[PDB]
Write a protein that binds this ligand. Structure first.
Ligand SMILES: CCCCCCCC(=O)SCCNC(=O)CCNC(=O)[C@H](O)C(C)(C)COP(=O)(O)OP(=O)(O)OC[C@H]1O[C@@H](n2cnc3c(N)ncnc32)[C@H](O)[C@@H]1OP(=O)(O)O
Ligand SMILES: CC(=O)NCCSC(=O)[C@@H](N)CC(C)C
Length: 433
């Protein structure tokens, strides 16, 4: 034989369950950058690129998932903590006729590139000066090594380290754990009795399932990046003081009521993304998130409060078993592949969007949020703020931009009228054009 494969196997770790599903899904279309997540922080002040690069180096040392390198092997793909070659581009676009548009185009050209996992770079950090005392920190990752909460933790840590370095202070000891402990915990869960309990619960929950209700007229795999319809809204349109749990309950209830009013289906299956972070996993950047199948049963004449109680019940009974992958449940239920458990996902991310870099305020804004197989309702909300950002992310094959926009406007209106009177049956509101 040849020793190279043996040394590859002995110097690597197996992928986690979520990483395995990500890799299996990406292998079908290796030229599709739909598995990139991306955001950018607008900083209202002066950023020194050298101090920022120093902070980025420190955080890359602190979050070892940023140094994961992947290697092919007889066992598909494996990973180790390697030495990625990275750089921080600094682009001053203040002289351009449209500095904001130039920065948007730069980051779009970045996150549109295909990402080969065995060569990298799996992440990209760059600074874009869009105005005097207005900078942009652009972050991009592949979902195989990062999710939403991980990127949020990394942005917070980078902000803190930069603020500490600017005032010449030693940054406090980082709170992060190692990605290897996360991988070991996932490997232990994969052969755990907790996993058997979760599998039994999810097999009983969606035992006799139904094909998902959807606003699209066709089912198609995700190939292009999402079509995004973004709208901002005030919290009083909801009015329910909601927390993350009840905000997600209300969003899922509204989406299920809209799907029932548009399709007539009464057993609406939605997708609910969750962190799957308990204990030490709450302080380890990387990929850990899952999507739960949330069933909402519709009865004609039912109001919003009953739907919200249904959603609260489903979450209260299902979040205990959120470690079981939805793909493993789909395979275990005996469903033919291509048949999904849910079509419309409701991704509520109650992560703080505010940061402080060297005394200057800054705000986070998403560009990519993973693949959009059908419809994804992304709800960005800083806990406490009176504002919500609502993104309709759609598969370009199943939707067109203006149709998605009309659906979003009608859904916003229907949801506002729903929250106006939670006792009125959903079959009564007249909807829009
Ligand atoms: C570059 C930037 C790009 C952006 C990246 C985007 C990438 C992605 O697409 S990843 C998707 C990101 N989204 C998310 O992370 C999902 C966020 N949202 C959510 O998780 C849900 O909508 C939400 C808010 C309902 C979860 O609510 P939350 O209250 O936090 O629940 P969670 O912590 O998951 O679980 C709590 C429940 O766990 C259950 N549980 C059982 N055992 C335990 C235990 N030992 N410890 C804790 N909880 C336990 C309990 O029943 C508990 O409920 P409760 O304590 O109230 O009885
Ligand atoms: C919603 C779905 O099943 N398809 C996309 C999965 S994309 C991914 O790995 C995560 N970042 C998002 C979920 C699992 C929290």
């Amino acid at each position: 034989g040849s020793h190279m494969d043996a040394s590859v196997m002995s110097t690597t770790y197996a992928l986690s369950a979520a990483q395995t599903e990500i890799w299996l899904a990406q292998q079908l279309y290796p030229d599709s950058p739909v598995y990139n997540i991306a955001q950018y922080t607008v900083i209202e002040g002066v950023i020194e690129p050298a101090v920022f690069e120093a902070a980025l180096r420190q955080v890359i040392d602190e979050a070892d998932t940023l140094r994961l390198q992947f290697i092919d092997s007889d066992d598909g793909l494996r990973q180790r903590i390697g030495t990625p070659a990275w750089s921080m581009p600094v682009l001053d676009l203040t002289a351009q006729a449209d500095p904001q548009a130039a920065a948007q185009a730069w980051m779009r050209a970045d996150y549109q590139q295909p990402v080969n996992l065995t060569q990298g770079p799996l992440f990209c950090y760059a600074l874009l000066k869009v105005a005097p005392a207005q900078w942009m920190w652009y972050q991009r990752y592949h979902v195989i090594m990062m999710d939403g909460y991980g990127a949020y933790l990394i942005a917070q840590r980078v902000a803190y380290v930069y603020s500490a370095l600017c005032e010449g202070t030693t940054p406090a000891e980082c709170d992060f754990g190692s990605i290897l402990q996360l991988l070991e915990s996932d490997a232990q869960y994969q052969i755990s009795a907790q996993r058997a309990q979760d599998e039994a619960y999810w097999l009983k929950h969606c035992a006799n399932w139904s094909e998902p209700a959807t606003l699209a007229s066709r089912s198609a795999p995700v190939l292009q990046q999402r079509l995004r319809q973004t709208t901002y809204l005030a919290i009083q349109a909801l009015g329910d003081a909601p927390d993350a749990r009840r905000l997600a309950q209300f969003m899922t209830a509204a989406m299920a009521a809209y799907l029932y009013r548009f399709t007539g289906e009464q057993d609406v299956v939605l997708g609910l993304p969750v962190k799957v972070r308990f204990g030490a996993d709450r302080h380890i950047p990387g990929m850990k998130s899952n999507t739960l199948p949330l069933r909402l049963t519709m009865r004609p004449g039912m109001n919003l409060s009953s739907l919200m109680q249904q959603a609260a019940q489903e979450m209260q009974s299902g979040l205990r078993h959120q470690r079981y992958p939805s793909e493993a449940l789909r395979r275990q239920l005996g469903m033919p592949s291509g048949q999904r458990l849910f079509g419309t996902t409701v991704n509520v991310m109650p992560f703080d969007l505010d940061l402080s870099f060297g005394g200057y305020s800054a705000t986070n804004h998403n560009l990519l949020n993973g693949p959009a197989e059908d419809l994804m309702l992304g709800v960005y909300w800083t806990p406490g703020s009176h504002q919500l950002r609502i993104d309709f992310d759609a598969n370009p094959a199943c939707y067109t931009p203006e149709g998605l926009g009309a659906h979003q406007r009608r859904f916003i209106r229907f949801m506002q009228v729903l929250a106006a009177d939670a006792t009125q049956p959903i079959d009564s509101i007249d909807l829009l054009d």
